[PDB]
Amino acid sequence: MSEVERALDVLLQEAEELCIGSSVVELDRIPTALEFCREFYSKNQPVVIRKALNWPAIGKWTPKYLIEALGDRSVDVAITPNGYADGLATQNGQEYFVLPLETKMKLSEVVRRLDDPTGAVHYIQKQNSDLPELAADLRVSDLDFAQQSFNKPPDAVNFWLGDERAVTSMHKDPYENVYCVISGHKDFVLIPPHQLSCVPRGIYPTGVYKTSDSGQFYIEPLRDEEGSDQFTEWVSVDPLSPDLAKYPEYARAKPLKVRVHAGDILYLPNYWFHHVSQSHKCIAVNFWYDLDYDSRYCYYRMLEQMTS
Amino acid sequence: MSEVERALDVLLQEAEELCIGSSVVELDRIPTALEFCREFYSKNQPVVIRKALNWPAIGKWTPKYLIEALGDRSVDVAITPNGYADGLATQNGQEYFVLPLETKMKLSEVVRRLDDPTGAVHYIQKQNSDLPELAADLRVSDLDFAQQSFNKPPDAVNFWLGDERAVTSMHKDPYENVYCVISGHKDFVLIPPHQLSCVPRGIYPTGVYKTSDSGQFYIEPLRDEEGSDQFTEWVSVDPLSPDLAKYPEYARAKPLKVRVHAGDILYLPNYWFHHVSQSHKCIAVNFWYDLDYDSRYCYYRMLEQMTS
Ligand SMILES: C[C@@H](NC(=O)C(=O)O)C(=O)O
Ligand SMILES: C[C@@H](NC(=O)C(=O)O)C(=O)O
Ligand SMILES: [Mn+2]
Ligand SMILES: [Mn+2]
């Protein structure tokens, strides 16, 4: 055993005896700003709040209503064959990290495509900071309890509507994430940052899903300025069915499972690994806040260097 | 570099670029409980608040006022020949970590010995108390702005009165510390936990000061039932006259210096390295709160493994 491995082992033993990030706290009432800063944000600790929101949206937002209120606008939608946009797929003997086919279609067309169990996997992800009627269905002020710890306005606000086959593979974000399911449920698999050395990562060629004239889906590699291949580091394990023979270290990881229902709020702290499934035609909005750096971030950068 | 050295280099370079623990924040107005939680407790960041307290004690507490008010009670006093209780000292060619001689004597005797420059170094530490005449002169609720981040009662409340020659060598505490100078000033040299690799530690035999039949001070080694010598890991650097030839890594440290005056409050975050000096007959009261574990403690234990 090298010194790096004994360091990582001490880290893990200490976190296991202390059960750091060993569960997702569950609340029935929204906390106060002070409670949220002290108990969750300051400990980099996730929490789910049940039936927290009574926004109009939660009862009225569906595909049909959305087309109605949004004047059946054209949308930017993401399509894949396997349902793993930003995920791993093999082609011609080569494993790629593949981005979605991003095309434009009328909301109604999306709703027809989601209703086809045999078709491709579609989802809509829109980012910003008709939208006013949608905004009339929301009271963002109600998230003050969390926002006061971040002490800045959301750097992004995302709306999500898609197919149950759309699976978001395990990744980490540099954001505090306040996640509000509107219609349906989202299933999260969470892993704390300090378990980095238990989550196998590889370097993969970058590809994008593309349609042919015939209509069959294929992967096209990506190039840089010079024309050389672009690469992407990514988590190699599949939380839903992990290959522990190929990835023994993942045996030491301790994923947490949480289902977030309509009206619930999930706080996903920055740099937590998350893998997301969902229910068919689930609608959700989340709010991304740029993180404030402290020693934890420098420790995690050190951890990234120790996990070559 | 070795793998571990490169890891440490990343940690320090990140923290340097991001100004982590790079200064003591200075406030002229007391923060709200939420501001304190968000800016200092949760970042593990020191802050000093100037002229923050209006306690009646700030003004009148002196050894004289204390004798007249307390009625020349007998108290526990700590005595050393060198002014370094819990500090390194050599004897017969061996370096020891040495505990004060602890004795009982009357306040008027301590005041008399505090006026003997030729005498040994004396200081009173009282751990906890509720005295009619003196609990009336403070108002601990005034510290709630910080106590609410800790959400617990103090583990200990220390009263300190000592000689200018009484120097507290550099060490770390498992507590959040709210430090309140009542009279005089205290000088702190602070180093953030993540700079551990820059702070040399050694393992030293443990001793306690004793006086011989003729009045000479000497170091008595500490032993257990088995008769084996007891040992203590201790910081080997002296931040007042640091020997960078012996400890080159200490040049990569960035110690912060702060003077806490009568009425000032200093938040010393948990596990921060501190070294303390004081003006003559300085009086101070501090509140320790057990720390709340999260990943930073585990990273710190890993750092300890990496630097040994
Ligand atoms: C794609 C995914 N969201 C995130 O990964 C996130 O909000 O960070 C989802 O909710 O399906
Ligand atoms: C002994 C020292 N206090 C501490 O070391 C502390 O409060 O942690 C002092 O007040 O000089
Ligand atoms: Mn994400
Ligand atoms: Mn201390």
UniProtKB/Swiss-Prot annotation, chains A, B:
Intracellular or extracellular location(s): Nucleus; Cytoplasm
Expression (tissue specificity): Expressed in the pars intercerebralis and fan-shaped body, regions known to be involved in sleep.
Known catalytic reactions: L-lysyl-[protein] + 2-oxoglutarate + O2 = (3S)-3-hydroxy-L-lysyl-[protein] + succinate + CO2
Residues that coordinate or bind succinate: 123, 179, 186
Alphabetical list of PROSITE patterns matching this protein: JMJC
Residues annotated for 2-oxoglutarate binding in this entry: 123, 168, 177, 179, 186, 288
GO cellular component: cytoplasm; nucleus
Listed GO biological process terms: circadian behavior
Disruption phenotype: Viable. Adults possess disrupted circadian rhythms displaying reduced daytime sleep. Adults show decreased tolerance buildup following repeated ethanol exposure.
Cofactor(s) needed for function: Fe(2+)
Signal peptide (UniProt feature, chain positions): none
Domain called JmjC: residue spans: 124-306
Stored PANTHER family: BIFUNCTIONAL PEPTIDASE AND (3S)-LYSYL HYDROXYLASE JMJD7, HYPOXIA-INDUCIBLE FACTOR 1 ALPHA INHIBITOR-RELATED
Subunit structure, interactors included: Homodimer; disulfide-linked.
Name of protein: Bifunctional peptidase and (3S)-lysyl hydroxylase JMJD7
Organism: Drosophila melanogaster
